[PDB]
Paper text:
The results showed that, similar to SHIP2 SAM, Odin SAM1 only selectively bound to the SAM domains from EphA1/EphA2/EphA6. To elucidate the molecular mechanism governing the specificity of the bindings of SHIP2 SAM and Odin SAM1 to Eph receptors, we determined the crystal structure of the SHIP2 SAM-EphA2 SAM complex and the Odin SAM1-EphA6 SAM complex at the 1.5 Å and 1.3 Å resolutions, respectively. The crystals diffracting at very high resolutions of both complexes were facilitated by fusing the Eph SAM domain to the C-terminal tail of the SHIP2 SAM or Odin SAM1 with a flexible linker (14 residues ‘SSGENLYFQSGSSG’ for the SHIP2 SAM-EphA2 SAM complex; 17 residues ‘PSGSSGENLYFQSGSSG’ for the Odin SAM1-EphA6 SAM complex). The covalent linkage did not appear to affect the overall structure of the complexes, as the linkers in both complexes are sufficiently long and flexible. The two complex structures adopt an essentially identical End-Helix/Mid-Loop binding mode, in which positively charged residues from the N-terminal end of α5 (End-Helix) of EphA2/EphA6 bind to negatively charged residues from the loop connecting α2-α4 (Mid-Loop) from SHIP2/Odin, forming the well-known tail-to-head SAM domain heterodimer. A noticeable feature in both complexes is that the backbone methylene of a Gly residue at the beginning of α5 from Eph SAM (Gly954A2/Gly1104A6) is in close contact with an aromatic residue from SHIP2/Odin SAM (Trp1221SHIP2/Phe738Odin). As such, replacing Gly at the beginning of α5 of Eph SAM with any other amino acid residues will introduce steric hindrance in preventing their binding to SHIP2/Odin SAM. The very high-resolution crystal structures of the two complexes also allowed us to identify a unique interaction feature that is critical for the exquisite specific interaction between the EphA2/A6 SAM domain and SHIP2/Odin SAM domains. Finally, EphA6 SAM could bind to both SAMD5 and SHIP2/Odin SAM domains, since it satisfies the binding criteria of both types.
Numbering used by the authors: 27 to 195
The structure:
């Protein structure tokens, strides 16, 4: 586009908007560090307890607020992209052509070497990974683990759908 793009808030600015900024360091230090990757499949009550949000009313408030954030479709890569789209004008869902490009789409590129060192370089390998499997290759921060597993789930849904349609199996 020729015109400007509006930028997303920081986690701190978002928390201030909902009266919960005292939890900023706990979120950031545990990988809840980008407002594009917070909310229902990603942020869970038990995780909030574990990182030290002991106040149950604040946990409920935070979880509801995270659910109110827009779901931002992942950006394609600057190199090659593979997209699924429903309808002539529907949203493009990227499927990626490399593990690195997939990780970059969720700002998790720092973990490419972790996946490579484990030999987890194909979709088929990665698609069945649990949170525990992800932690075990060295993704320690809970907010990053949750982000990755949520992304895997949505990518797997799209890939299964395509397979079920019966042409690219």
């Amino acid at each position: 586009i020729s015109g400007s793009r509006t930028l997303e808030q920081s986690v701190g600015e978002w928390l201030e908007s909902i009266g919960l900024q005292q939890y900023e360091s706990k979120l950031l230090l545990n990988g809840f560090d980008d407002v594009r990757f917070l909310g229902s499949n990603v942020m869970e009550e038990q995780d909030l307890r574990e990182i030290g949000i002991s106040d149950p009313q604040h946990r409920r408030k935070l979880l509801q607020a995270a659910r109110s954030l827009p779901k931002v479709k992942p950006s394609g890569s600057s190199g090659e992209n593979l997209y699924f789209q429903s309808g002539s004008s529907g949203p493009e869902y990227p499927l990626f052509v490399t593990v690195g490009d997939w990780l970059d789409s969720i700002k998790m590129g720092q973990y490419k070497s972790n996946f490579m060192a484990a030999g987890f370089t194909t979709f088929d390998l990665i698609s069945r990974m649990s949170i525990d499997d992800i932690r075990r290759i060295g993704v320690i921060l809970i907010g990053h683990q949750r982000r990755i597993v949520s992304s895997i789930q949505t990518l797997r849904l799209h890939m299964m759908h395509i397979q079920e349609k019966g042409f690219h199996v």
